[PDB]
Design a protein around this ligand. Structure first.
Ligand SMILES: Nc1nc(Nc2ccc(S(N)(=O)=O)cc2)nn1C(=O)Nc1ccc(OCC(=O)O)cc1
Length: 272
């Protein structure tokens, strides 16, 4: 990662929190192309000082994905390691995370919008699968909306997948349980079961989010009941808009080896 000076970063408003991180909108002063000076909006992801032990996991995962440039993968500008904070300096996506976008725009979003976003997310995941890179935290919060749909120009929405974050292979067990049903059953049984098949399960959960107006599946269940949900081998309820429910359930297969390839997922999406 390119090293960015603290003096060249301005921290502005808080945009919430991630997993052991605090999120800020900011500005980066930089020399750009042709030597032109720019002040660039950036997303600043700040690893909590009280969790400095997780620093390696978060930045290594952001790094590994940043080694694969792709139109549906978020761009990382570099890191700021000045002072006592570890900061990922990321592109600022205008419309933020999809989980909040789905809630705020539930009435406006139709099946065509959902299918397009699903197709784009599957394209990103197919790219990762072909490169044998595990994301490990596919969820609507980690889908960033670059561009809204514009029916006036027929422009579809455009999304990117955010950085993996701290690996579930090092996260505390209680955070993993709260991340049911995005974390697949085999990773609850053993977080070292993390595998490409992990992302197929979480992709199913993410489609469920996309189809559920920003609702969080199983949010009414506490961590103990989420554990028992997997023990009893339940599936998620079909979303009211059920057009993707079969695909959701096919992806959320309790047998990891039976989960379909992203190529097959894409073929299925193209058939709707
Ligand atoms: N690159 C980027 N650009 C924006 N732009 C943005 C954000 C919010 C708004 S808001 N509030 O006014 O609606 C508007 C714009 N967000 N962003 C992200 O990476 N967010 C993000 C933050 C934390 C995450 O954590 C996941 C986890 O670690 O569990 C995941 C994702």
């Amino acid at each position: 990662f390119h090293k960015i000076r603290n003096e060249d970063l301005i921290f502005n408003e808080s945009l919430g929190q991630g997993t052991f991180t605090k999120i800020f909108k900011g500005v980066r002063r930089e020399v750009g192309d042709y030597g032109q000076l720019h002040e660039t909006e950036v997303l600043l992801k700040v690893l909590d000082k009280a969790h400095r032990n997780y620093s390696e996991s978060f930045f290594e995962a952001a790094s590994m994905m940043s080694k694969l440039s792709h139109k549906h993968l978020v761009l990382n500008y570099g890191v700021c390691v000045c002072g006592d904070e570890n900061i990922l300096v990321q592109e600022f996506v205008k419309f933020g995370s999809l989980d909040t976008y789905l809630k705020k725009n539930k009435n406006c979003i139709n099946i065509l919008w959902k299918l397009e976003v699903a197709k784009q997310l599957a394209a990103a995941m197919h790219f990762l699968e072909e490169n044998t890179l595990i994301h490990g935290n596919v969820c609507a919060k980690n889908i960033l909306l670059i561009r809204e749909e514009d029916r006036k120009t027929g422009n579809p929405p455009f999304i990117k997948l955010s950085d993996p974050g701290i690996s579930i292979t090092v996260l505390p067990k209680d955070i993993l349980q709260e991340r049911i049903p995005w974390v697949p059953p085999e990773c609850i049984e053993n977080p070292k079961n993390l595998n490409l098949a992990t992302d197929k399960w979480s992709f199913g959960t993410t489609l469920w989010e996309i189809c559920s107006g920003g609702d969080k599946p199983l949010s009414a269940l506490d961590s103990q009941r989420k554990l028992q949900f997997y023990e009893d081998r339940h599936q998620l309820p079909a979303p009211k808009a059920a057009e993707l429910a079969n695909l959701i359930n096919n992806c959320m297969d309790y047998e990891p080896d039976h989960r379909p390839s992203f190529r097959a997922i894409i073929r299925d999406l193209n058939s709707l």
